[PDB]
What we know:
Helix content: 40-55%
Shape: globular
Protein name: RNA-directed RNA polymerase
Binding site for Mg(2+) 2: 221, 319-320
Bound molecules: manganese (II) ion
Organism: Hepatitis C virus genotype 2a (isolate JFH-1)
Subcellular location: Host cytoplasm; Host endoplasmic reticulum membrane
Membrane topology: Single-pass type IV membrane protein
Distance between the termini: 35 Å
Structural class: alpha+beta
Strand order of the largest sheet: 2-10-9-5-7
Radius of gyration: 24 Å
Number of domains: 2
Amino acid sequence: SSMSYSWTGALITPCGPEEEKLPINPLSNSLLRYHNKVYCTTSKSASQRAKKVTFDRTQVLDAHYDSVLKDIKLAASKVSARLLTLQQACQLTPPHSARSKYGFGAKEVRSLSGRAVNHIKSVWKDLLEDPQTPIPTTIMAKNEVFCVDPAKGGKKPARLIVYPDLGVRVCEKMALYDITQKLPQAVMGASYGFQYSPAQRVEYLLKAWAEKKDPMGFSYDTRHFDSTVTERDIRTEESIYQACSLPEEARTAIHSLTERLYVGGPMFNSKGQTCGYRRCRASGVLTTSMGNTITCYVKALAACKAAGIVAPTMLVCGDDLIVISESQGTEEDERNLRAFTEAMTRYSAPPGDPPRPEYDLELITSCSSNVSVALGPRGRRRYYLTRDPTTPLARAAWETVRHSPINSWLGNIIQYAPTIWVRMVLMTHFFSILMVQDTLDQNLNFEMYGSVYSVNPLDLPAIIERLHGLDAFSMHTYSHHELTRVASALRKLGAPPLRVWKSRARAVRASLISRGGKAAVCGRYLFNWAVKTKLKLTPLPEARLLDLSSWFTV
Ligand SMILES: [Mn+2]
Ligand SMILES: [Mn+2]
């Protein structure tokens, strides 16, 4: 039926300047050596991406899909959602959000400037009055950093980002922001993945695994998910939104945004030239995350019915899915997963990599992470969330005139504090850098799900205990998979091996302790793994007074 995109031949041009690596990387050339391997995706590869995601979608639904969709609409109907005032929506605009073609930017929006408020007022009226004229969007290449993979062609091409003007983005929040805060939990409950901290995610997956008599689990991820979303998927998303109790003015704007923006529209490059036409999800609209997660859930739950998955417990984040279910024996499990994949392919969610049943929790990777196991000194098994450290380490080494990688370091330290690579490598490097700079007490930003939280490095012990438990400071015996992966990624990036990081951490620890105060607490808690004679760590009173509850929610 419909093509995901069509193209005029105009270039996807850069949105301003694209940074050069410099001949010296002074903050990370003591972390790793192979800086040649660290690269940033740019508009230069945007055309290769465009080719890869342009294809004809043919979508065939069935009675399982219809039954699931009915249950989801009924679940939606329990939600009451309100319009945000124009001013409320204005003040949720991030401080550096891309400015408007109409001579104002995020600063004016956040301060309720007269010019910006009046312009947005007219954008909203036009939404209530015109349910049809397509809204123009800008297309740009995502700039993000990876390590070269020769096994996969060297450098990945940049993702495509598609977004409307700042005035429209404010209007989207007026109509749909409150729905984004309520709909996913309402239709998915515990299956909604973007409500869990790493430790809570682990706990959820362990609980599901344990309650199967004979558990089987698998992961599923869709190839180029946004381009596989059909105009009919998007209209079905509106009908799920419309299932909630909404004032009529919201219903009118929701429909108008769907027909004029969400289902498709023309795309212009940063130079204003017409560039193509979109008939799929625009990654950049307010409903991208919620839409992906709900549509993924509809298709996946229906495909579970198609395939005969027994007693499925799901975890869905965007287009990432884990299903833990009752095994029917490996032979039927293999067939069922093929049925699952075939059904998802009919629903227009074809697989990136073919899914495979697994019977060991460590071997299932979803949303770029997996559960692993370490011991204490106790022999007591402790489970925690980890991931391949390759991309975390590459981003740790991106340094330009415009970009400092230190927030990146801190983010990984916070999210993956129990891991051996954070504890021995990133933590060691982080405190070493900040000590030599004498900036240990200068706050840094932790960035997660579009929010920024101010963090003082010297509070990391309390933050980590609050998020991960004191066990995060005493994991002893890591798993074979995890040791292999971490050693391999350090070799791949030219970083010192773990034994060298141990020697460095002994020195960092001694320096931290010698400074007394909070710094000494960092040394004793975060680097207890480094010394032969372990100190007995006790609960930190400050951790009880931390409300980190919004850090890993939307
Ligand atoms: Mn995907
Ligand atoms: Mn994915």
